Amino acid sequence: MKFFSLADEAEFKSIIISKNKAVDVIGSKLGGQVVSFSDEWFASAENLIQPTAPIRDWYDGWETRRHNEMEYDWVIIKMGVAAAHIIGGEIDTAFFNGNHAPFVSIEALYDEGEEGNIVEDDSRWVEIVEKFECGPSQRHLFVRGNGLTKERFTHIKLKMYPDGGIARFRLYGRVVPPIIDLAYVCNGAVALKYSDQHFGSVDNLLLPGRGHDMSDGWETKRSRQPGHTDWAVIQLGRESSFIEKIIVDTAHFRGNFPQFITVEGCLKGTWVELVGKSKTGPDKEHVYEIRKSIRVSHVKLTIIPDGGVKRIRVWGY
Amino acid sequence: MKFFSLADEAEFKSIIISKNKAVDVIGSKLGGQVVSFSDEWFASAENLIQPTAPIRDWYDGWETRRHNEMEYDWVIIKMGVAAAHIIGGEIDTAFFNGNHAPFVSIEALYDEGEEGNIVEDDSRWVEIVEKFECGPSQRHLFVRGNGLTKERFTHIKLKMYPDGGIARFRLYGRVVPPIIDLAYVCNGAVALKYSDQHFGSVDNLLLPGRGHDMSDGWETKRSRQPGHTDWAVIQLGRESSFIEKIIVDTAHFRGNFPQFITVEGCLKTWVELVGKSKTGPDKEHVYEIRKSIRVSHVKLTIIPDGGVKRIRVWGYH
Amino acid sequence: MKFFSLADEAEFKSIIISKNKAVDVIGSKLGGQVVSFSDEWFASAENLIQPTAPIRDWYDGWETRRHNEMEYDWVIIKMGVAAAHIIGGEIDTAFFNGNHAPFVSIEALYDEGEEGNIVEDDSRWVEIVEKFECGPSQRHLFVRGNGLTKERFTHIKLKMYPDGGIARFRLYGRVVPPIIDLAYVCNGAVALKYSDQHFGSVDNLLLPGRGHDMSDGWETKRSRQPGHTDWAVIQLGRESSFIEKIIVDTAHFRGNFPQFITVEGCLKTWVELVGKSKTGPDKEHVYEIRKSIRVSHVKLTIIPDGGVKRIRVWGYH
Amino acid sequence: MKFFSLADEAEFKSIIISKNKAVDVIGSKLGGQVVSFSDEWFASAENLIQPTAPIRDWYDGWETRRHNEMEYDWVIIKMGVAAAHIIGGEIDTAFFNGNHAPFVSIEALYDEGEEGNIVEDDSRWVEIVEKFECGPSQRHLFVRGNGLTKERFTHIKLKMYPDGGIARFRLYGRVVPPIIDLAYVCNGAVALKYSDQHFGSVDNLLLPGRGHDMSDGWETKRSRQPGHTDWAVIQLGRESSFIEKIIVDTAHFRGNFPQFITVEGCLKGTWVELVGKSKTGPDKEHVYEIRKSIRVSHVKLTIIPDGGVKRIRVWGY
Amino acid sequence: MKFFSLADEAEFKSIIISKNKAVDVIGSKLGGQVVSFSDEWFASAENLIQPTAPIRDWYDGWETRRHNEMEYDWVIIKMGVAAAHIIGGEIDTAFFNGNHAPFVSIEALYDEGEEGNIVEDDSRWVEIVEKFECGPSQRHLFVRGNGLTKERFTHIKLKMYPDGGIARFRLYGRVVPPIIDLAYVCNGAVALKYSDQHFGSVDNLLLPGRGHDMSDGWETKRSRQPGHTDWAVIQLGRESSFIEKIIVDTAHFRGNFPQFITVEGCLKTWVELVGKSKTGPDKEHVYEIRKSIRVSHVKLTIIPDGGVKRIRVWGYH
Amino acid sequence: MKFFSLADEAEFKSIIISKNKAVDVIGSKLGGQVVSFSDEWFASAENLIQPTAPIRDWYDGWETRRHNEMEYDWVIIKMGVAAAHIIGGEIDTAFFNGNHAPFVSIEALYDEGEEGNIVEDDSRWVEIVEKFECGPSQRHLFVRGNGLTKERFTHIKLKMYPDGGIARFRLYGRVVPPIIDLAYVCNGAVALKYSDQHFGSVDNLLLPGRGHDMSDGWETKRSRQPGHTDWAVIQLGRESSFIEKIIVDTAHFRGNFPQFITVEGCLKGTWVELVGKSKTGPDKEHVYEIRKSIRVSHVKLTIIPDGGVKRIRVWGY
């Protein structure tokens, strides 16, 4: 289990995103749910998986009562996705300076069907991340020493020895997919690179639903340089052959949506235009019928000159 | 399709709950999620499936802009449940007087796996409920003339002609079963009878997770006469042959948790499965049975009253 | 001086609106401003001229301290309009039960230019409305027996004997006209008829600026029958001889702006000045006429309903 | 067009106030109004002219949608005063770091009478301040290269190429006046110098109305030094000959109003007492009958030992 | 023990106020303080003695958890007063419907000095009020059949059988007198009659300190007929022989303080002690008498109405 | 009168607490009340004695109107305790930077019985702390040059020459006590030393009542070191001989109450166990019957491994 410091978050993201095409599979934004837990006295376990960063001044996180008599506190979380292989994750103890979780370990298990709610007592649990030490009010970026778990997993269990507080818990993993949305996160797609993110993130583009407001989308500052543009490179969770339609949803972007957009395709060198410059409108699902055969592995959305987009869909085989 | 007036809700349930063994398969509490919609100008589409009763003042409901160019507005909702057969539902237009939905019609569709977010266009959409008329600020309890739909669906589509507002949308259906939690709502269990429901319904007993607070559970009024007790009759999604674990969870109930609880089983005459046991607060109570019985309906008894969050029943057959 | 009961508001308007062509010349919405007052101990004098109806709970009104040493309390208000002849007004004592104004009397005055803030002392103050009696928590609609005052004024003074509270003070008067906006309230135009007023009155159509939000405009209920339309009949401050520009402004109406609008002219039989045109949201619609017509009353028609912020009509004569 | 930095605001105020006797003639505090504008999506154009300084955390200013297709956005503001000559002004882009207006130019025009609402299209518009560049989150103090415009103006137009945000817009100008209030701002009077201002400003003394609270008055910290005093030198908008009465209004100053006051007069060298030490009371209009003939150009109010005053009036010829 | 219905409150007071000369000796306003309690799970025990009437929504009252193992829940309250004899009180179960206190009983105890906080256990606790039954959301005005208790107490104990909620608990008793303030509540004075009580009762006149705001005083409605006056008849804790100072305190009454006040004395025919004097706001009015009179009941007269905070009367005997 | 700086607060506390066994006898937390005052215009005199530290952004303190004509402003405060000897105190002018009280002096007086409310005019007042200078926004720790006043006192009077603001006023004094609670503050007990205080203070343990929430108790951070503990040494206000029972109340500490506690006794050298390790529960009054004879002067409560306690009682002779 190698650790990373804020100083090298760049490298950490590289090991996680670019090299292992993984995502925070327990995040609520994508479907993650809290199945159970041992205690939740000062702050709810649900706080652990929210998309927003921890706020202060009540605590934004999971804090249990004091003096646990059990060897550890715990929580069981079900991935939003069908299953995935784990590479690493984050444990943020933000604003918990002292009463933070002293040590933490993670376990996983695979449950064929939604037969019921998993119990912490289940015999299928398996250690995914050996016990390690946490520091106060900080982020712990960690990767498994051997990398991607060779087994598939559906539920994960966080353990805090013996109790305390954790602000956020992120667990990155390679989605094991179930005509389909090739750029859908639940199908294995992930956001790779991007010009910039002001609010929201490029990985919001590959999510379920149209969202609730502009916060769950991808937005970029108001630029001024001529010929300026913004872009996001998504790696479809499965190389295409036939792309029927590409959808660019600007839902909730009413006064800051892009002026034009263009989509391109690349195969694991040259980029090919799939949807040339197209004037876009506010809060709409602009649908582009491609009906073309191409072997693309990556898609690139370009916002011009900048703006906000909620989602991008790429239906095909 | 028959409609029921408020003074007939008693019979309405009879049709959907006792007879058809249905439950609200699109509500959030259970996993219902908005996939998309044509517009949400004045009020968010997600409000539709909330578990709370509409609240006044912003509008606690769904509302599109005026003068729709298309023939109707729509919202696409994915079932929380794995699949279900439909019988009817509720369309509450609360607090929308005049600008309420003139007409509504419902369509269902069956999609195998989360390939992506279904589109209005999809040629699999079929009419499940013929277009009927809505009135100002009221509830519309309806049931399909032909009872349950022979087919089973995973997503439903609501159509409002041509635009306006709907406060709530409940769609009732019989869940299709995917050791298993035999009382778990996802496996087809439903609550038929209850002695009392002061706060939170009895159908909360059979849901995923442990919830957020006392509101997603079952709570009865405070009683005074000796020997008084409250109960909930639950129909297992399948008859049992063997039962290993029964779990009564009082999570979140700290000052009003029941004093003692018992669990009796029946085949449709009652047999004791769990003898009178003193319960505690915000705790999971695990009772080992290791016995074999052919019970179909279970009955939780809390004494003298109080609240319980969940009841699990692990068995076979 | 005659008074009208609520069940007579219908006739009240007839007298002031249709007959005398008056408008509330001291309200803030139109430019009314408090110049000074003798006291505002419990509630601000500025509340008097607000466009909203009194709201309960602080007191939404004007209230002076108890036991006034002088004979009466007073407030001096300057007309928004350039000058006007008075017919009557409203004195709403809403929510002031018992400590309401026992008596009230009104005085007017004509001051050329903004030399400074007029004083109570000024020897130009003349009685326009004889001292009458007010009752607890109610509205007092009154009209001068001698109709319009032969003279024209710029400031008015309200006297409360000897102290107490008044929720609202409306003073109706016929504006004195200073290419010109012939429908502009400052030039003497007034709205006589309207098919409907769900939110915001039709007299908002003829005001300065584009307003703040949807509240300072005209909005009609959402309609359902085909071919339904809503309208507003406006009397120009002067008959036209030539009309160059007509402008329909829907500023702030983004989801309920009208679909199409038309403008007909009449001389007091209607003539089309602006043919059916599709309108947009939060936009100014400029229609060139370059024609000559002797119209006195204009009529805006929005289809099928919705809201409009302003209507301008530039002409001659 | 010479610019000034916060470092030399002192000199800027000198060029504007002392040398050109000008005031912020479009300020709402004095009567400035927003007539129209091109867009107002993120923040209202009315925010531009409010008396208070820009606050943060919604934006306190004027921000338009993105990617304007028109060459520039704009707003038309009507001065509170009858007319004035312009010398300069301020453009604050506070808290707009990046999305601020890249460039700005100002235009003016004179409209004989309130014939209607001016259109940005009017042919009378005249460039008053050539296009210049703005920086992020900062104040831009600017003066016209040639100084006071030889022409009179009533409306001014701010243009933002092509869109963005401006926090505040101040436009200083010499008021062209219409027995009168010689110290009335609408008559050309201006606050020249002053010992100090804690809350509110000395220029609040020459405003219309009695105000709403202590914020629109002039207040000084609680001093302790013996024989300490505070003063404000106003320059009447017109040399006097006969001063009938001087009014000192302490409206809204109930616990921090001055203990004594004295008024003096000077002619453009020696100061002459007009109202000697006079014990003052709370929330009152202390009226001093002078009935004296004097050629004063400047008036000086002295607060002892300190305190709060709402307004000072000086009636005469 | 007799109970009185609301339509009998008139008689209730007669018994406790005029006859027995009692006052609410446990309310906070007067010094009542919670010493301890068995439980406060859903609602704080301190709410019981608040001077305000119960307010809805949290619960404005006292509420213990469900299923008490002991026979009853309890709260221990220490009298503000030095000691008192009990006659009866009020038990308001407002807003507690069903989960209200089934039964209640009261016990008193006399402890010399503040040795510590009394315990439920203490063998000095004696029954003062036999266990009676309470109903849902209502007031219970009761009086002891045997009138005043022969003994005097310092602390009282409320017992709720077995658990539930009580909104308010008033306990009436005749205070035991420890130059002295002869009208001071702690010396046994009580208010018998008043002409009017619009805001705040007359018994506030005789309390410790000057209070917090206008709410802890006596305020009468605004009157209109000439010569109208309001009064309060107060019974001194002892007859006077000599009276040196009378003090009328209008602290906090700034805009509704009385205009003039007078004070007459009587022996139980009235004699003037303080002649008509003009009163001021938020000020203490000290009137020297230096005379000897055998008065027992004093009478404060405010003209024409208004509010007064306190009335002190220093004398001998 | 020697002063102390924040730098030597440690020494100041030593002179006050350890050497003179004194406490803040006018604090509201212990019973202190405001009897009267000269003015309270900007901020209530009651703010002076609240237990919490001064907050900002209305002012948290006592601020009077400006320009007092009287030689000084003042306030009369009654100690919560029966009487005490004074050693020193604190005057905090927090957040009052400039308008703070320039000078201050303190007076005291003894009133046999609660005969009435003391007047600032009383002849018994005695100078306890000669007039001294205060600085802006700071704490003034001061001790009487000669120390403990040889006389007993019940009321104290703060004087501010001539007016301004004081944030807090603390007056430490040795309590003159009235089977009893030997560790009760009202009996002369005081908190001496302690391992640490996170929230609340160790001196909260010796207070009246059970409190309102966790803020009026003694709590320590969540520790992690093995064998870690927390303790508080109380000095009984009177050496014991027979200790009947010791009570440890953990009221309001539900999730952070200690796991075990032990009480010890010492005589003015060796510590003796009085209550050995005892598992403690939440929100309960753990009662320990000692029924032992011992000459202890000091008591020591030990929290293990840490936690929160509301009060400790020690009944005996």
Curated annotation (Swiss-Prot), chains B, C, E:
Induction: Repressed by nitrogen.
Entry EC number(s): 3.5.3.4
MF annotations from Gene Ontology: allantoicase activity
GO biological process, one term: purine nucleobase metabolic process
Domain of life from the UniProt record: Eukaryota
Catalysed conversion reaction: allantoate + H2O = (S)-ureidoglycolate + urea
DNA-binding in keyword set: no
Pathway: Nitrogen metabolism; (S)-allantoin degradation; (S)-ureidoglycolate from allantoate (aminidohydrolase route): step 1/1
UniProt keyword list: Hydrolase, Purine metabolism
Function: Utilization of purines as secondary nitrogen sources, when primary sources are limiting.
NCBIfam families: allantoicase (TIGR02961)
Membership in a protein family: Belongs to the allantoicase family.
The name this protein goes by in its record: Allantoicase
Organism expressing this protein natively: Saccharomyces cerevisiae (strain ATCC 204508 / S288c) (Baker's yeast)
Gene from which the chain derives: DAL2
